[PDB]
């Protein structure tokens, strides 16, 4: 695995596209070499190159999604791929504010008649 993720991050978007085309073409010729009787050093190169494409594609996708998250951070209608991670049950449950809601009659009574602190002498 020789792509040096530190170097991928410094590259620009077009450079990533240009590099991805170079890697894919180089990998394609290495598939030919293995079939046509390649050397073990060539075969080990084939395994290595496959990891750069996975490494290279991850950075492009991660950066693109991160930019999208910033774009839709203030948006009213966020795409479902960018909403907070929950389960189906969690979405359906009432909000904590809704659960604790009380009527004005009960809210004012609890204000005027709270649970006192006391103790019994023995």
């Amino acid at each position: 695995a020789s792509l040096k993720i530190s170097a991928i991050k410094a590259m620009s978007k077009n450079d990533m596209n240009a590099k991805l085309i170079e890697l894919k073409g180089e990998l394609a010729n290495l598939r030919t070499a293995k079939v046509t009787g390649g050397a073990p050093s060539k075969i080990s190169r084939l395994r290595v190159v496959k990891k750069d494409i996975a490494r290279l594609l991850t950075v492009m996708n991660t950066q693109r999604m991160e930019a999208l998250r910033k774009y839709y951070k203030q948006a009213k209608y966020v795409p479902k791929e960018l909403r907070p991670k929950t389960t189906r049950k969690e979405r359906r449950q009432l909000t904590k504010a809704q659960l604790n809601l009380k009527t004005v009659k009960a809210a004012k009574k609890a204000q005027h008649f709270p649970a006192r602190k006391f103790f019994v002498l023995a």
Binding site: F113, P114, K117, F118, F119
Partner: protein, 92 residues
């Protein structure tokens, strides 16, 4: 002696065994302790009346009831709206 044993049904699915009993004590005791730490006068087991038992078989004995009637609170000069907040049971 004529035997009367009701084992003709599937008692094997009706058997309840008490292997959880030594751990009910630990559960209830720990929760009972947890209540005292949180707000102590809640596990205080708020005050309850002294009411006679029913029927002539028991009527000479006294036992704790549930809640003081509204007339007993007035005689003791306690508001019923304040009684529930200071560990007094009230039973209208």
């Amino acid at each position: 002696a004529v035997s009367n044993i009701h084992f003709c049904k599937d008692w094997r699915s009706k058997v309840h065994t008490w292997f959880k009993q030594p751990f009910r004590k630990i559960r209830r005791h720990q929760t009972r302790v947890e209540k005292a730490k949180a707000v102590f006068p809640a596990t205080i087991k708020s005050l309850k009346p002294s009411v006679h038992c029913m029927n002539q078989r028991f009527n000479y004995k006294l036992r704790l009831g549930r809640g003081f009637t509204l007339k007993e609170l007035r005689a003791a000069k306690i508001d019923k709206n304040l009684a529930r907040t200071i560990g007094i049971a009230v039973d209208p």
